[PDB]
């Protein structure tokens, strides 16, 4: 039996299997075809992942179906303090806990005394949105500039990372829409229902819909994907979020609209996994080589050039389980209770004979580590 494997490319090259051929064996075959460890490969078919020990018959893989193969190792912390996540592009090259910092938006020093602590994303994302008096001599300094750095290791004061607004530490023990596991962290989709997806699933979701070319062109935004359950008006607008796919898959995303153009005209894409390059032959030509300015292929079947003939829904309970949205403490020194009034973890005690500033979560004296890790609740 012949199925088609899409591996980090939109053309599905063929592989022979029987009914009794296992998934982990199908992987082993594509693994040694492409110089890639099979303990990193993931079989995706009609939006469901196929398990190693399943067979073609267990999978109901008919003749001339199309599977996807994608390189993401499965990675098996729930109780984390942190509130924010950046994408660190060196060294880490992955999603890490963000460390939050503020400075005056004019002089650019750590001298801006904030009118009040932030409590939500818009406070620290939207420009000129919060305020204070800079202490710097002779600085007009009216506006706070919040910036994020990777938390995992030391960072200089200019070595910043982009925030991932959509990503949350899964403190609410919410299950994933696609795979139904309680994983942390998760990406919350900006649909009505706030459907939740784990980072693994997200990866697979993006890379398959990349190979399918089922990405959505929004006139006033570029190319993106909605919430996986097809929720209306849920395109991820904050396009820095497709950086969490790693350089290589992210680089395919940056080429997508360039490639879609080449097809618009009448050209066609090189099928090699790796080279996703666009080419513009004579409309009536059947032979096509990688000329921008590697190999020669057949315009029709997209194999090494030859002669004569060429050879979703999500679950209801999963989707309702996966919605992100579905008092006073004693002052650590004086012991008298205070309420929190918003999202901010910065507390001050109002008894004037103690007046301790403290972290609401930790019950310790307020400090840069709580400031950076969990200034506010999310
Ligand atoms: Cl975040
Ligand atoms: Zn880092
Ligand atoms: Zn200033
Ligand atoms: Zn998942
Ligand atoms: Zn949704
Ligand atoms: Zn090529
Ligand atoms: Zn052909
Ligand atoms: Zn007190
Ligand atoms: Zn704290």
Numbering used by the authors: 1 to 76, 79 to 83, 144 to 353, 355 to 356, 361 to 378, 391 to 405, 414 to 465
Sentences from the paper on this structure:
Phosphorylation of both Parkin and ubiquitin is required for maximal activation of Parkin E3 ligase activity.
To understand precisely how the pathogenic S65N mutation affects Parkin activity, we crystallized and solved the structure of the novel human Parkin PD mutant (UBLR0RBR, Δ84–143) at 2.9 Å. Comparative analyses of wild-type and ParkinS65N x-ray crystal structures did not reveal any conformational differences between the wild-type and mutant protein, indicating that the S65N mutation does not significantly perturb Parkin structure. However, as the S65N mutation prevents incorporation of a phosphate group at this position, the absence of a negative charge at the UBL-IBR interface inhibits the ability of ParkinS65N to adopt the open conformation required for full E3 activity. This contrasts to wild-type Parkin, where phosphorylation at Ser65 induces key conformational changes and new interactions. Immunoblotting of protein extracts demonstrated that the S65N mutation was functionally equivalent to the S65A mutation, leading to both a loss of both Parkin activation (as judged by reduced CISD1 and Miro1/2 substrate ubiquitylation) and reduced phospho-ubiquitin accumulation. Immunoblotting with anti-phospho-Ser65 Parkin antibodies demonstrated that Parkin phosphorylation was abolished in cells expressing S65N. This was associated with substantial reduction of Parkin E3 ligase activity as judged directly by ubiquitylation of CISD1 in PARKINS65N/S65N fibroblasts. The probe revealed robust labelling of activated wild-type human Parkin in control fibroblasts, whereas this was completely disrupted in PARKINS65N/S65N mutant fibroblasts. Characterization of patient-derived primary cells demonstrates that the Parkin S65N mutation is inactive, suggesting that the loss of PINK1-dependent Parkin Ser65 phosphorylation and subsequent inactivation in humans is sufficient to cause PD.
